[PDB]
Structure 1
Amino acid sequence: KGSRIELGDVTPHNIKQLKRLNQVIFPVSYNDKFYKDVLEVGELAKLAYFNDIAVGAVCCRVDHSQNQKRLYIMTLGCLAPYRRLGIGTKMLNHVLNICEKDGTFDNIYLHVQISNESAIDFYRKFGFEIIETKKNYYKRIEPADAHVLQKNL
Structure 2
Amino acid sequence: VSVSLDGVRDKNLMQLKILNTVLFPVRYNDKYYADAIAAGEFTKLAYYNDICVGAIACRLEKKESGAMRVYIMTLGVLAPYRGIGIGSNLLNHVLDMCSKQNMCEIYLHVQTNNEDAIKFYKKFGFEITDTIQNYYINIEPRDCYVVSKSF
TM exceeds 0.5?
yes
Q: CA deviation at 1:35?
A: 1.3
Match of 2:93 in 1: 94
Distance, in Å, in 2 between the alignment partners of 1:31 and 1:126 is 29
Q: C-alpha root-mean-square deviation of aligned residues, in Å? A: 1.8
Give the number of aligned pairs. 149
- The one-letter amino acid of 1:81's match is P
Match of 1:61 in 2: 59
Q: CA deviation at 1:69?
A: 1.8
**Percent sequence identity over matched residues?**
53
Distance, in Å, in 1 between the alignment partners of 2:149 and 2:37 is 26
**Secondary structure, counterpart of 1:13 in structure 2:** helix
After superposition, the C-alpha distances for 1:52-91 in whole angstroms (9 at most, x for unaligned) are 2111111112112363421111111111222111111111
Whether the 8 Å CA contact 1:6–1:52 is kept in 2: the answer is no
Q: Out of 9, 18, 22, which is 2:7 matched to?
A: 9
Note the 1:4-153 alignment, pairs <5 A.
4-65=2-63, 67=65, 68-103=67-102, 105-138=103-136, 140-141=139-140, 144-153=142-151
Whether the 8 Å CA contact 2:38–2:59 is kept in 1: the answer is no
Whether the 8 Å CA contact 2:35–2:58 is kept in 1: the answer is no
Distance, in Å, in 1 between the alignment partners of 2:70 and 2:109 is 12
Distance, in Å, in 1 between the alignment partners of 2:38 and 2:64 is 24
Q: Which runs of 5+ in 2 are unaligned?
A: none
Q: Which runs of 5+ in 1 are unaligned?
A: none
Task: State TM-score, norm by structure 2.
Answer: 0.89
